[PDB]
Design a protein around this ligand. Structure first.
Ligand SMILES: [Zn+2]
Length: 472
């Protein structure tokens, strides 16, 4: 059967199912409604940065159509909606003056979701730093971000927290550090060889440290001032793709493990255990900032749940560890990526080159967190795959590969849960085809098709798959 035995009865009682978007990817109204520019506005408006010189000026126009989109998610039998608040739509300069029109938009969205029985899971930050903060402070290179993020977070807790009980601070800070400061392909486009300046060996570590300190400061504020009255929770969203040893050799197993620690341990070891992974301490040395005892105690235990975005898996091949001149965060791992074992590829690729369809990666990731980190409360905060550009409407709608993706990945998730993994919910990336950063509109992750000429929504087969699977 096309559900493959999956239904709500196959997951724990009260398990949360939802879909995800992010502000800049779906809202539109990027320079209207009082919204100030983000670093992505500036980046996307520079010729050559995004596929087809496209931007999020209009995107899916959810800003106007949110009630349509909420009605649709409810008709598809989802329980929750993960979306993000645009910082610069609340604070056009990221500090100081409040944009009341921006506040009303989020009030209206939140109130409508609640009216329709959909639980809001709210992200504070999803790559969209107010441009004014980038220019004035140097963004995430500056430790002052903790104070700036905390004041932002405080406003949002005050303003929406009588209704919103499930918060996230950040979305995938590893991607910010990697793409913005190591490879320099996302804003602020910084790296060792980059026009804007930078240093791929040091800056990604600075950035990540500042994300962790900002997260911890925001949570400290939540807990000391709002928790008692509001009684909600705050977590963080971390990306985690799976690494599998290419062979059972000591070297390859050590490689896969290093990759895990440099990928997920970078953030999880501080959040759970109050220190960076030992291997990162040993290899990165003085390029890795040190938490004071006070800071480490602020960071440790500061996430009420861990969001994991899980997409793919890779084989890892190891080498003997060498003394090396530092070049980059990426090169610091001392691993080789491999995409075939015994002559067979790990999986076919979706539209995005990095996304290999590997359902057992989901089991790998969830089981690993369960076994290594004391089985913390995990929420799968994003999981999905993309179709390419230029297909006909009907081709988009008949997304059989995506149907197969979700059934297989959710089966593997069910396997980990049945074995005792503390997973509280699952969210599909994405509700709608949207602005997919560097790929602009050439990458389609939605379970709902969006015609980018007319802006019409059309549910795909995978939407109907969810609707069947999630019926009450
Ligand atoms: Zn509109």
């Amino acid at each position: 059967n096309w559900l493959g035995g999956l239904s709500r009865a196959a997951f724990p009682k009260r398990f949360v199912f939802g879909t995800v978007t992010s502000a800049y990817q779906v809202e539109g109204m990027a320079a209207s409604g009082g919204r100030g520019p983000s670093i992505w506005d500036a980046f996307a408006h520079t010729p050559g940065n995004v596929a087809g010189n496209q931007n999020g000026d209009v995107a899916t126009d959810q800003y106007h159509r949110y009630k349509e989109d909420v009605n649709l998610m409810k008709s598809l039998n989802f329980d929750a909606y993960r979306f993000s608040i645009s910082w610069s739509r609340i604070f056009p300069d990221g500090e100081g003056r409040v944009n009341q029109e921006g506040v009303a938009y989020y009030n209206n969205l939140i109130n409508y979701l609640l009216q329709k029985g959909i639980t809001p899971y709210v992200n504070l930050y999803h790559y969209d730093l107010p441009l004014a903060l980038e220019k004035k402070y140097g963004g995430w290179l500056n430790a002052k971000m903790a104070d700036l993020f905390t004041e932002y977070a405080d406003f949002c807790f005050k303003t929406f927290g009588n209704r919103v009980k499930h918060w996230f601070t950040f979305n995938e800070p590893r991607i910010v550090a990697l793409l913005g400061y190591d490879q320099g392909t996302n804003p602020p486009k910084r790296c060792t060889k980059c026009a804007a300046g930078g240093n791929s060996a040091t800056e990604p570590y600075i950035v990540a440290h500042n994300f962790l300190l900002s997260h911890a400061a925001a949570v400290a504020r939540y807990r000391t001032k709002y928790q008692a009255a509001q009684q909600g929770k705050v977590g963080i969203v971390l990306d985690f793709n799976w690494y599998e040893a290419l062979s059972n050799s000591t070297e390859d197993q050590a490689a896969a493990q290093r990759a895990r620690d440099f990928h997920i341990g970078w953030y999880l070891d501080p959040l759970i255990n109050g220190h960076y992974p030992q291997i990162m301490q040993d290899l990165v040395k003085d390029r890795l900032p040190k938490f004071t005892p006070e800071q480490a105690r602020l960071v440790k235990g500061s996430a009420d749940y861990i969001g994991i975005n899980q997409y793919t898996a890779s084989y890892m091949k190891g080498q003997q560890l060498m003394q090396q001149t530092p070049t980059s965060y990426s090169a610091d791992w001392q691993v080789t990526y491999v995409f075939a074992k015994n002559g067979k590829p790990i999986g076919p690729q979706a539209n995005s080159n990095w996304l290999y369809i590997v359902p057992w990666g989901m089991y790998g990731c969830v089981n690993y967190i369960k076994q290594k980190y004391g089985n913390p409360t995990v929420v799968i905060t994003g999981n999905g795959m993309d179709q390419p550009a230029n297909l006909s409407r009907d081709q988009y709608l008949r997304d059989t590969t995506r149907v197969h993706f979700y059934r297989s990945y959710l089966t593997q998730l069910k396997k980990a849960i049945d074995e005792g993994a503390n997973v509280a919910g699952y969210f599909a990336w994405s509700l709608l085809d949207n602005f997919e950063w560097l790929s602009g509109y050439t990458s389609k992750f939605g379970i709902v098709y969006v015609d980018f000429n007319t802006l019409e929504r059309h549910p795909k087969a995978s939407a109907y798959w969810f609707r069947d699977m999630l019926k009450h």
